[PDB]
Amino acid sequence: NYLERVVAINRVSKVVKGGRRFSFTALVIVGDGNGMVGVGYGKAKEVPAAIAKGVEEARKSFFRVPLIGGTITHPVQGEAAAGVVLLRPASPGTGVIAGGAARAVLECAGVHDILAKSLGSDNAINVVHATVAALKLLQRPEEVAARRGLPIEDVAPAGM
RNA sequence: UGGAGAGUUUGAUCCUGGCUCAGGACGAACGCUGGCGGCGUGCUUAACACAUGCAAGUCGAACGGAAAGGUCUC
Ligand SMILES: [Mg+2]
Ligand SMILES: [Mg+2]
Ligand SMILES: [Mg+2]
Ligand SMILES: [Mg+2]
Ligand SMILES: [Mg+2]
Numbered sequence: 001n002y003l004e005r006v007v008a009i010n011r012v013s014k015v016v017k018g019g020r021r022f023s024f025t026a027l028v029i030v031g032d033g034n035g036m037v038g039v040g041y042g043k044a045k046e047v048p049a050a051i052a053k054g055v056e057e058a059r060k061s062f063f064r065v066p067l068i069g070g071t072i073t074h075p076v077q078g079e080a081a082a083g084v085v086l087l088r089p090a091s092p093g094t095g096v097i098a099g100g101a102a103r104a105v106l107e108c109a110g111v112h113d114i115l116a117k118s119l120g121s122d123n124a125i126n127v128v129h130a131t132v133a134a135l136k137l138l139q140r141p142e143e144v145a146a147r148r149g150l151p152i153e154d155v156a157p158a159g160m
Numbered sequence: 161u162g163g164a165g166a167g168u169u170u171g172a173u174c175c176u177g178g179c180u181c182a183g184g185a186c187g188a189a190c191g192c193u194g195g196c197g198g199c200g201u202g203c204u205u206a207a208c209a210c211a212u213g214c215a216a217g218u219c220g221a222a223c224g225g226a227a228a229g230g231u232c233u234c
Contacts, residue, residue, distance in 0.1 A: 013172045020171055082175060091161055099164045117163050121175070 028054030078134025084120035
């Protein structure tokens, strides 16, 4: 009952005396589609096995995403090894304006209204890691107001 | 009120970094094809050389007059 997206599958190799031993990696995104998403790498000698391992890794590594009604609360910039991803909230009309990896992550997390731009490296793994880093950096109004005081010193027009 | 990427250096990897493509636009040209209407638009090159016709006249209520028409007129 989850949403699973396999993002990138590539064939890696290792050289031995005989020749090249091939294997497969399959980066997988898994999320409940509502507010919670996980990422798992996964790797094996066969594509379905790698996909499976990615699925269990992601499902074990679920984490929670702060939404404010179908979009993220405030703009953020996430930083992976060398991938840079910029996310900004948008009005309810907009869709998900994102690239491949970022779109996978956001649509599995259950985000409907986002402008996502990748500025650093183009590797899919690092783009995914930067996106999850930005989602970690995200904040909620309720604990920012808990940290500061008098939880009205913000702007909460919609609510619901 | 608005921002999408992909291919390509390696046995494989991650960076750096060029090259290339997917969009739009045109006072356009060319290829194939071609029913109609509405509204626009048409020498971007030789400020090269130009046949022909037309693109600046008007006033008799300023004037002397009488080539033309109309006149009473011989
Ligand atoms: Mg770069
Ligand atoms: Mg080399
Ligand atoms: Mg080597
Ligand atoms: Mg490149
Ligand atoms: Mg000219």
